[PDB]
Amino acid sequence: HARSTGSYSLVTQQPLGGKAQFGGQRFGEMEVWALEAYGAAYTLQEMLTVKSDDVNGRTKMYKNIVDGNHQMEPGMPESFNVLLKEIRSLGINIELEDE
């Protein structure tokens, strides 16, 4: 199996095969530890932000990939944002401080 950019899940935006075109491989916690043991932060950030959970980051990246510019403008992963809303839906006020 192989995938570059396929379909995406509605609830949380994450790679999901809907066409029999398969969803991406699952990057687990142990793999994250593997990237953590290596000094590679950017590989990890792009792994769990732009390549996967960032709804803006994925397209904003794709345009750069085709433009011939390798960068990332990560933003915030949609999962943690959903978790912000889920926590904040309770009597719990969660805020992002400073600047």
Partner 1 sequence: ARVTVQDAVEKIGNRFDLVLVAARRARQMQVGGKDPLVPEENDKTTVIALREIEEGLINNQILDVRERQEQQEQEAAELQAVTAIAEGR
Partner 2 sequence: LKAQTKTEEFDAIKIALASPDMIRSWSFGEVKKPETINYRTFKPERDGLFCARIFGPVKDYECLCGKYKRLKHRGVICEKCGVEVTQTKVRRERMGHIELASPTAHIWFLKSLPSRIGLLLDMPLRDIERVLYFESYVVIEGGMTNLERQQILTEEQYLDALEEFGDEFDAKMGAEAIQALLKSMDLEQECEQLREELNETNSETKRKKLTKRIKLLEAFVQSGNKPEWMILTVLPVLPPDLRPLVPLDGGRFATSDLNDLYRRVINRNNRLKRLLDLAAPDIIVRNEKRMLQEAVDALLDNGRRGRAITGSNKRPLKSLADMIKGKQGRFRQNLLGKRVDYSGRSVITVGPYLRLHQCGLPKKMALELFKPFIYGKLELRGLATTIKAAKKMVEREEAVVWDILDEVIREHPVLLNRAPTLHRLGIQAFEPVLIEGKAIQLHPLVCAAYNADFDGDQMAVHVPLTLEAQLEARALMMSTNNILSPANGEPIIVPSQDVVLGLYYMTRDCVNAKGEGMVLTGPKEAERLYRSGLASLHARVKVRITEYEKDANGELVAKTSLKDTTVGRAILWMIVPKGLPYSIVNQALGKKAISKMLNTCYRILGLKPTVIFADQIMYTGFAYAARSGASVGIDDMVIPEKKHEIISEAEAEVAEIQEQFQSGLVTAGERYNKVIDIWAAANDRVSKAMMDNLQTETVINRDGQEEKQVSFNSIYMMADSGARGSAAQIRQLAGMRGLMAKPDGSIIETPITANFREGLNVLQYFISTHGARKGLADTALKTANSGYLTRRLVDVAQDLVVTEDDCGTHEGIMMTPVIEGGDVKEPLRDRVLGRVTAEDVLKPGTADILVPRNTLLHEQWCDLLEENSVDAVKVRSVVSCDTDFGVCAHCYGRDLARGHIINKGEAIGVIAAQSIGEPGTQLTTGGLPRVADLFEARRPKEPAILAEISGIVSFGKETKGKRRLVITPVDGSDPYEEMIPKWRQLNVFEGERVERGDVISDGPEAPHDILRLRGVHAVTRYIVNEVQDVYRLQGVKINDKHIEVIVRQMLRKATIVNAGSSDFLEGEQVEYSRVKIANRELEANGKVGATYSRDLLGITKASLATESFISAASFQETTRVLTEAAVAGKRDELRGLKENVIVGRLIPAGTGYAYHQDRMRRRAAG
Q: Which residues bind partner 1 (CB under 8 A)?
A: 39-40, 68-71
Q: How far is the CB of 63 from partner 2 (least distance, A)?
A: 9
Q: Which of 89, 58, 84 is closest to 72 using CA atoms? A: 58
Residue 60 binds partner 2 (CB under 8 A): no
Report the nearest approach of partner 2 to the CB of residue 68 (Å).
Answer: 6
**Contact in structure between 22 and 1 (CB atoms under 8 Å):** yes
Nearest distance, CB of residue 20 and partner 2, angstroms: 14
Asked if 15 and 52 touch (Cβ cutoff 8 Å), the reply is: yes
